[PDB]
Design an enzyme around this catalytic site. Structure first.
Site, PDB file in Angstrom:
ATOM      1  CG  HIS A  54      -2.108  -1.007   0.985  1.00 29.69           C
ATOM      2  ND1 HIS A  54      -2.126  -2.210   1.657  1.00 29.69           N
ATOM      3  CD2 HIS A  54      -3.206  -1.004   0.192  1.00 29.69           C
ATOM      4  CE1 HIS A  54      -3.188  -2.906   1.290  1.00 29.69           C
ATOM      5  NE2 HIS A  54      -3.861  -2.196   0.400  1.00 29.69           N
ATOM      6  CG  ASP A 103      -8.556  -1.702  -4.073  1.00 30.11           C
ATOM      7  OD1 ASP A 103      -7.370  -1.267  -4.068  1.00 30.11           O
ATOM      8  OD2 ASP A 103      -9.173  -1.962  -3.021  1.00 30.11           O
TER       9      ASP A 103
HETATM   10  C1  LIG Z   1      -3.259 -12.884   1.311  1.00 30.25           C
HETATM   11  C2  LIG Z   1      -3.373 -13.445  -0.088  1.00 30.25           C
HETATM   12  C3  LIG Z   1      -4.824 -13.445  -0.571  1.00 30.25           C
HETATM   13  C4  LIG Z   1      -5.250 -12.041  -1.000  1.00 30.25           C
HETATM   14  O1  LIG Z   1      -4.266 -11.434  -1.843  1.00 30.25           O
HETATM   15  C5  LIG Z   1      -4.418 -10.132  -2.225  1.00 30.25           C
HETATM   16  C6  LIG Z   1      -5.302  -9.330  -1.525  1.00 30.25           C
HETATM   17  C7  LIG Z   1      -5.485  -8.002  -1.870  1.00 30.25           C
HETATM   18  C8  LIG Z   1      -6.506  -7.273  -1.033  1.00 30.25           C
HETATM   19  C9  LIG Z   1      -6.014  -6.096  -0.238  1.00 30.25           C
HETATM   20  C10 LIG Z   1      -6.424  -6.274   1.217  1.00 30.25           C
HETATM   21  N1  LIG Z   1      -7.558  -5.366   1.346  1.00 30.25           N
HETATM   22  C11 LIG Z   1      -7.701  -4.609   0.257  1.00 30.25           C
HETATM   23  O2  LIG Z   1      -8.467  -3.658   0.115  1.00 30.25           O
HETATM   24  N2  LIG Z   1      -6.864  -5.017  -0.683  1.00 30.25           N
HETATM   25  C12 LIG Z   1      -4.803  -7.428  -2.954  1.00 30.25           C
HETATM   26  C13 LIG Z   1      -3.894  -8.189  -3.692  1.00 30.25           C
HETATM   27  C14 LIG Z   1      -3.678  -9.542  -3.369  1.00 30.25           C
HETATM   28  O3  LIG Z   1      -2.817 -10.346  -4.068  1.00 30.25           O
HETATM   29  C15 LIG Z   1      -2.055  -9.875  -5.175  1.00 30.25           C
HETATM   30 MG   LIG Z   2      -7.767   0.275   0.806  1.00 26.70          MG
HETATM   31 ZN   LIG Z   3      -6.227  -0.325  -2.538  1.00 35.10          ZN
END
Ligand SMILES: CCCCOc1cc(C[C@@H]2CNC(=O)N2)ccc1OC
Ligand SMILES: [Mg+2]
Ligand SMILES: [Zn+2]
Ligand SMILES: CCCCOc1cc(C[C@@H]2CNC(=O)N2)ccc1OC
Ligand SMILES: [Co+2]
Ligand SMILES: [Mg+2]
Ligand SMILES: [Zn+2]
Lengths: 334, 335
Positions: free
Chosen positions: A84, A242
């Site tokens: 982030h 996102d």
């Molecule tokens: C922990 C692995 C399973 C989830 O993986 C991901 C999870 C997210 C979500 C994040 C957490 N909250 C959000 O608003 N965005 C983004 C990319 C990911 O992988 C490339």
């Molecule tokens: Mg966020």
């Molecule tokens: Zn985000």
């Protein structure tokens, strides 16, 4: 102040120019952009998107005010957070830019609605501390207290994003009328709050209902009669953006995965040090990177994008195919 | 509540860490090594060790788990991507303060509460530092400069953050202090942290010097400070000396400190240039002499400060002064 060709200083202008050819495409490599922009991917991409859509002239935004705000915004993403940080902001913004251009949505949104969507995407994670809402709640932090434990981070991103407009020469909205500023603000608040993952299931169910009774014009362009439907599409669009990492070329997707797991693992380590419950997927000793992505796609990302592809049919077919190939790669790498 | 590691923090290099920690009470401690051997948790490690060393957990009935939770929380509020003002700098200043408190000429001068305050102040004195000076926050009209009316903007913020973090879950290390003790500690910590604002240097040093010229010494050559006014004055200068202690450490450490402050300064300058702001002093990478700047720093600020401190505690700081003079020569002959 100097306004460089691509919004930021660069020691590699030609390589940067070459990547920016892909500005309007899903296949843009934001990692290359970032390298060639000396870490300023957000200021670069937002400058370029704003020039591309002629938004500075459309809203009488002085160029130095735009760049000052974008640098200020970018500086409030933390470089020490593995996922982030401003690169994620830049990526979500660029993805939103492309999604706005989808043929099924041609001429549907006003420039103000477009402006709102892009600004929402740029600020949507500003000042992210690299730990989840639950961590802030469990530590009794000031931010969790401030927002009653409800969408703690998403509320904070909004407050920081708008508050930064007040720093010196940062009010990019100075020349919007009152009604314009109010309508944009309302839209942005709606979009950023919808980025809270705890709202995901609610958001998807409503997107589905909306898709069931969608109206298409003569050439298969969507008809969005009312505000309610327009903001619904825009909140889901930013949400899709996102959650767009698994829909990108495998090479990029894998970099996003390493980054999120580094961030999650560091949270889990901090939780362990503090005697707290370790959050889901944050325990490096037991978490599987590949299995987590498979489950993530199967239960969150694919059902979301499948519904989106339905909305804008046939425009997002390729994304869905890519998403299926990427699931299979992670499934096989097990 | 949690299992407290031997040195307060998790380590896969426990014996190497133990060896460095033998120097806890010495000026020659290498905090960079502590950091390497404590997985980057220099501030939590050193603070834990100092509090055990002085038996402060028992003296003030501070639960160990509460101490540790607070320390980890505090250290996590120092930014890792800031080249100089990260938790390593806080760890450094805390450990230096800890050594300066033990100086023979100050023996039995300060209460346990005054010692607790000094160490707490040192640990929090730069927490949540953004890597830019007060002037940058003032010139950009930031929320903080507005809140604090452009006066000691950062230092006020460090104080606000250090205190606020006590309210996080199981972080209130002062829970067993009395109300009078809390009020007195708060006031002392405020004075010490605000005194780390460099725009106060001149008055601090003028006040210290005046004290040196009329100092009273007991039977053994130990300092005599009858009243609070004198005591907080010495504490303020002590934390300010510790904050300005880099040029007084062995050359190898001092050079690493210099590398770090310049990286941080140049980054501020790069951001000023992007913004079309006037670039702050010594923040221009294109036109800067690292070596002259160090010489100027010592000549105008650090040496008069330390000479005056050495006069206060004479002769306990003689070696510190000698190192300073030798390090000055090095940067001078390296120009
Ligand atoms: C922990 C692995 C399973 C989830 O993986 C991901 C999870 C997210 C979500 C994040 C957490 N909250 C959000 O608003 N965005 C983004 C990319 C990911 O992988 C490339
Ligand atoms: Mg966020
Ligand atoms: Zn985000
Ligand atoms: C620019 C070089 C001249 C000054 O160098 C230094 C200056 C500081 C002081 C910082 C700036 N403000 C403070 O309150 N503390 C610390 C270490 C330094 O070098 C090792
Ligand atoms: Co930062
Ligand atoms: Mg300071
Ligand atoms: Zn300091």
């Amino acid at each position: 102040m100097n306004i460089p060709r691509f919004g930021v200083k660069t020691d590699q202008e030609e390589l940067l120019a070459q990547e920016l050819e892909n500005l309007n495409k899903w296949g843009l490599n934001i990692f290359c952009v970032s390298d060639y922009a000396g870490g300023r991917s957000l200021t670069c991409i937002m400058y370029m998107i704003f020039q591309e859509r002629d938004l500075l002239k459309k809203f009488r935004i002085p160029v130095d005010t735009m760049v000052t705000y974008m640098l200020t915004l970018e500086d409030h993403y933390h470089a020490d957070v593995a996922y982030h940080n401003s690169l994620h902001a830049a990526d979500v913004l660029q993805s939103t830019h492309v999604l706005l251009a989808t043929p099924a949505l041609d001429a549907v949104f006003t420039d103000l609605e477009i402006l709102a969507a892009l600004f929402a995407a740029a600020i949507h994670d500003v000042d992210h501390p690299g730990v989840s809402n639950q961590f802030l709640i469990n530590t009794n932090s000031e931010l969790a207290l401030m927002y009653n434990d409800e969408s703690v981070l998403e509320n904070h991103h909004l407050a920081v994003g708008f508050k930064l407009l007040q720093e010196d020469n940062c009010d990019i909205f100075q020349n919007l009328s009152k009604r314009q500023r109010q309508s944009l603000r309302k839209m942005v608040i709606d979009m950023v709050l919808a980025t809270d993952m705890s709202k995901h299931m609610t958001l998807l169910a409503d997107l589905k209902t909306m898709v069931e009774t969608k109206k298409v014009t003569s050439s298969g362009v969507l008809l969005l009669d009312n505000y309610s439907d327009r903001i619904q599409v825009l909140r889901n669009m930013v949400h899709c953006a996102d959650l767009s990492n698994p829909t990108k070329p495998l090479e990029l997707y894998r970099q996003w995965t390493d980054r999120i797991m580094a961030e999650f693992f560091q949270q889990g380590d901090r939780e362990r040090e503090r005697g707290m419950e370790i959050s889901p997927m944050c325990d490096k000793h037991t978490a599987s990177v590949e299995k987590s992505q498979v489950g993530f796609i199967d239960y969150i990302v694919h059902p979301l994008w499948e519904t989106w592809a339905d909305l804008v049919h046939p425009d997002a077919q390729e994304i869905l195919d890519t998403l299926e190939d990427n699931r299979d790669w992670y499934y096989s790498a097990i």
